[PDB]
């Protein structure tokens, strides 16, 4: 009897820890990717401004 209820309650806490912890790790990774891909687009916008300046010069 009692050992099943203990194991299921411990596994209930395990599910509630894991699903949230995986979502938190995804949130952090998506935020890092947002910054990295933004910088790549910023380099292209910078290169346009520099080419445009060289043309005006």
């Amino acid at each position: 009897s009692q050992s099943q209820g203990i194991q299921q309650l411990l596994q209930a806490e395990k599910r509630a820890a894991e699903k949230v912890s995986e979502a938190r790790k995804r949130k952090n990774r998506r935020l890092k990717q947002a910054k990295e891909e933004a910088q790549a687009e910023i380099e292209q916008y910078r290169l346009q401004r520099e080419k445009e300046f060289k043309a005006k010069e």
């Binding site: 009692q2 203990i6 309650l9 411990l10």
Partner: protein, 39 residues
């Protein structure tokens, strides 16, 4: 002598009840903790 005996009786009676009540509450807590150590 009357004031000594009166004040000591009133004090000691109050302490005996309060300390015994605390002892029972802490005894219940010992049993509760011993069962929750299974989980």
């Amino acid at each position: 002598n009357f004031e000594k005996i009166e004040n000591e009786l009133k004090e000691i009676n109050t302490n005996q009840e309060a300390l015994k009540r605390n002892f029972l509450e802490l005894t219940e807590l010992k049993f509760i903790l011993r069962k929750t150590q299974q989980f």
